[PDB]
Design an enzyme around this catalytic site. Structure first.
Site, PDB file in Angstrom:
ATOM      1  N   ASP A 193       1.780  20.519   9.537  1.00  0.00           N
ATOM      2  CA  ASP A 193       1.349  20.053   8.089  1.00  0.00           C
ATOM      3  C   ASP A 193       0.051  19.480   8.248  1.00  0.00           C
ATOM      4  O   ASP A 193       0.043  18.227   7.779  1.00  0.00           O
ATOM      5  CB  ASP A 193       2.292  19.112   8.046  1.00  0.00           C
ATOM      6  CG  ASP A 193       2.732  18.994   6.383  1.00  0.00           C
ATOM      7  OD1 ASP A 193       2.115  20.011   5.669  1.00  0.00           O
ATOM      8  OD2 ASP A 193       3.123  17.959   5.867  1.00  0.00           O
TER       9      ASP A 193
ATOM     10  N   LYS B 200       4.696  -0.787   8.297  1.00  0.00           N
ATOM     11  CA  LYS B 200       5.706   0.081   7.626  1.00  0.00           C
ATOM     12  C   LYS B 200       7.388  -0.487   7.696  1.00  0.00           C
ATOM     13  O   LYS B 200       7.357  -0.978   8.790  1.00  0.00           O
ATOM     14  CB  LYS B 200       5.748   1.479   8.355  1.00  0.00           C
ATOM     15  CG  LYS B 200       6.530   2.541   7.846  1.00  0.00           C
ATOM     16  CD  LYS B 200       6.611   3.782   8.803  1.00  0.00           C
ATOM     17  CE  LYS B 200       5.401   4.611   8.962  1.00  0.00           C
ATOM     18  NZ  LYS B 200       5.154   5.523   7.839  1.00  0.00           N
TER      19      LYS B 200
ATOM     20  N   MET C 150       0.891  -1.010   0.020  1.00  0.00           N
ATOM     21  CA  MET C 150       0.039  -0.096   0.130  1.00  0.00           C
ATOM     22  C   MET C 150       0.781   1.069  -0.053  1.00  0.00           C
ATOM     23  O   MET C 150       0.527   2.515  -0.366  1.00  0.00           O
ATOM     24  CB  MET C 150      -0.843   0.103   1.032  1.00  0.00           C
ATOM     25  CG  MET C 150      -0.485  -0.333   2.486  1.00  0.00           C
ATOM     26  SD  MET C 150      -1.397  -0.356   4.092  1.00  0.00           S
ATOM     27  CE  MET C 150      -1.817   1.277   4.042  1.00  0.00           C
TER      28      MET C 150
ATOM     29  N   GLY D  50       5.628   5.186   1.337  1.00  0.00           N
ATOM     30  CA  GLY D  50       6.044   3.936   1.471  1.00  0.00           C
ATOM     31  C   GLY D  50       7.200   3.599   2.372  1.00  0.00           C
ATOM     32  O   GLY D  50       7.936   4.780   2.598  1.00  0.00           O
ATOM     33  N   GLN D  51       8.009   2.592   2.405  1.00  0.00           N
ATOM     34  CA  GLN D  51       7.346   1.146   1.702  1.00  0.00           C
ATOM     35  C   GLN D  51       6.176   0.720   2.909  1.00  0.00           C
ATOM     36  O   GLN D  51       6.817   0.617   4.229  1.00  0.00           O
ATOM     37  CB  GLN D  51       8.045   0.106   1.556  1.00  0.00           C
ATOM     38  CG  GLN D  51       7.836  -0.561   0.350  1.00  0.00           C
ATOM     39  CD  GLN D  51       9.109  -1.418  -0.301  1.00  0.00           C
ATOM     40  OE1 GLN D  51      10.109  -1.135   0.229  1.00  0.00           O
ATOM     41  NE2 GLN D  51       8.813  -1.547  -1.752  1.00  0.00           N
ATOM     42  N   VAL D  52       5.144   0.596   2.570  1.00  0.00           N
ATOM     43  CA  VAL D  52       4.146   0.222   3.604  1.00  0.00           C
ATOM     44  C   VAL D  52       3.309  -1.071   3.298  1.00  0.00           C
ATOM     45  O   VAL D  52       2.909  -1.037   2.161  1.00  0.00           O
ATOM     46  CB  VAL D  52       3.069   1.217   3.857  1.00  0.00           C
ATOM     47  CG1 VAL D  52       1.942   0.817   5.181  1.00  0.00           C
ATOM     48  CG2 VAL D  52       3.803   2.473   4.371  1.00  0.00           C
TER      49      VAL D  52
HETATM   50  C1  LIG Z   1      -2.861  10.243   1.580  1.00  0.00           C
HETATM   51  C2  LIG Z   1      -3.336   9.016   1.278  1.00  0.00           C
HETATM   52  C3  LIG Z   1      -3.244   7.901   2.580  1.00  0.00           C
HETATM   53  O1  LIG Z   1      -2.623   8.437   3.286  1.00  0.00           O
HETATM   54  N1  LIG Z   1      -3.884   6.903   2.223  1.00  0.00           N
HETATM   55  C4  LIG Z   1      -4.322   5.719   3.008  1.00  0.00           C
HETATM   56  C5  LIG Z   1      -5.444   5.137   2.731  1.00  0.00           C
HETATM   57  C6  LIG Z   1      -5.800   4.026   3.513  1.00  0.00           C
HETATM   58  C7  LIG Z   1      -5.116   3.804   4.553  1.00  0.00           C
HETATM   59  C8  LIG Z   1      -3.874   4.457   5.023  1.00  0.00           C
HETATM   60  C9  LIG Z   1      -3.311   4.145   6.536  1.00  0.00           C
HETATM   61  N2  LIG Z   1      -3.956   3.559   7.350  1.00  0.00           N
HETATM   62  N3  LIG Z   1      -2.913   3.101   8.294  1.00  0.00           N
HETATM   63  C10 LIG Z   1      -1.867   3.910   7.959  1.00  0.00           C
HETATM   64  C11 LIG Z   1      -0.428   3.893   8.817  1.00  0.00           C
HETATM   65  C12 LIG Z   1       0.688   4.357   8.092  1.00  0.00           C
HETATM   66  C13 LIG Z   1       1.908   4.515   8.716  1.00  0.00           C
HETATM   67  C14 LIG Z   1       0.291   4.758   6.742  1.00  0.00           C
HETATM   68  C15 LIG Z   1      -0.967   4.881   6.066  1.00  0.00           C
HETATM   69  C16 LIG Z   1      -2.002   4.256   6.686  1.00  0.00           C
HETATM   70  C17 LIG Z   1      -3.646   5.639   4.387  1.00  0.00           C
END
Ligand SMILES: C=CC(=O)Nc1cccc(-c2n[nH]c3cc(C)ccc23)c1
Length: 296
Positions: free
Chosen positions: A136, A42, A24, A25-27
């Site tokens: 931010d 992450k 879904m 980075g890298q995540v």
């Molecule tokens: C700007 C778009 C975005 O962040 N999309 C997104 C869409 C769906 C889930 C997450 C998200 N959930 N939990 C997280 C934890 C981290 C570290 C990064 C993203 C997520 C993030």
């Protein structure tokens, strides 16, 4: 071996356990097999960019301290190998940026009310409990899920972008504080309530900075049927002179926040509907060729 606290319990885990459901980075989206929880993991590579890694560890530090703020995404634990650090986080549904883009139009006021309660409490916690000024606040940092939860994102959470910058961050009335973030929240809410970012015609960052300083602060249009309360809250947030712009403690008594602290709003449904509706199914459209050369 990693150590995860999730589902009310404590688990000793091997990074290998986790079922990878893809980037879904890298995540990575990952399932913890022992419980069924689906999570975000992450990956901070030891070899990675030294600036990215710095920020990741600062953010992580604040998140580890924030277990008792229900409005900040939670960290379930960490794994350290020779080559990496894996950081298990709460998986959300989307950022409000994504959501505005998917919908191609406004988020209803009632959803934004619940969102404002969440985000103001998150930002206030961070300042009161940890001395952090977020710096931010923007829709990409506001997260929603299918349980109806709205949280501030871990990204940048330890404390910029021209579009959400307050007058006093561009040209302060005395050189030589959280109210800049109150302004960014204001701009965020106008953007999401309308589906139109308030400085859309700007083609460069400097141009945006110019509008912020030279123009009247953006407002919720008075003709769209936003409540008087919501119009006031935004108007307060977008007070150009930071000296008269309210702090979080004053915002938390504002009628907009106060009503949405107890008003029943089914965000989970509204979220589920909107994500189903806006799934692009199939209806693909061939892109248009570039206009060929012509002499006029
Ligand atoms: C700007 C778009 C975005 O962040 N999309 C997104 C869409 C769906 C889930 C997450 C998200 N959930 N939990 C997280 C934890 C981290 C570290 C990064 C993203 C997520 C993030």
């Amino acid at each position: 071996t990693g150590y995860l606290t999730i589902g009310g319990q404590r688990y000793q885990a091997e990074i290998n356990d986790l079922e990878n459901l893809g980037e879904m980075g890298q995540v990575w989206k990952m399932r913890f097999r022992k419980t069924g929880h689906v999570i975000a993991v992450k990956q901070m590579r030891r070899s990675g960019n030294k600036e990215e890694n710095k920020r990741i560890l600062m953010d992580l530090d604040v998140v580890l301290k924030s277990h008792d703020c229900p409005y900040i995404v939670q960290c379930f634990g960490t794994f350290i190998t020779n080559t990496d650090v894996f950081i298990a986080m709460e998986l959300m549904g989307t950022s409000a940026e994504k959501l505005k883009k998917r919908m191609q139009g406004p988020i209803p006021e009632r959803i934004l009310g619940k969102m404002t309660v969440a985000i103001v409490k998150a930002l206030y916690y961070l300042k009161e409990k940890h001395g952090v000024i977020h710096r931010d606040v923007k829709p990409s940092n506001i997260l929603l899920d299918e349980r109806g939860q709205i949280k501030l994102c871990d990204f940048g959470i330890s404390g910029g972008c021209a579009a959400y910058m307050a007058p006093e961050r561009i040209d302060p009335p005395d050189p030589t504080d959280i109210r800049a973030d109150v302004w960014s929240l204001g701009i965020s809410l106008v953007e999401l309530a309308t589906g139109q970012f308030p400085y859309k015609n700007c083609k460069t960052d400097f141009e945006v900075l110019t509008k912020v300083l030279q123009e009247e602060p953006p407002l919720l249009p008075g003709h769209m049927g936003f409540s008087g309360d919501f119009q006031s809250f935004v108007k307060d947030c977008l007070t150009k002179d930071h000296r008269k712009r309210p702090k979080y403690n004053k915002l938390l008594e504002h009628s907009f926040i106060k009503r949405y602290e107890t008003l029943e709003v089914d965000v989970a449904s509204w979220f589920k509907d909107v994500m189903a509706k806006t799934e692009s199914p199939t209806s693909g459209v061939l892109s248009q060729p570039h206009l060929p050369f012509f002499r006029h």
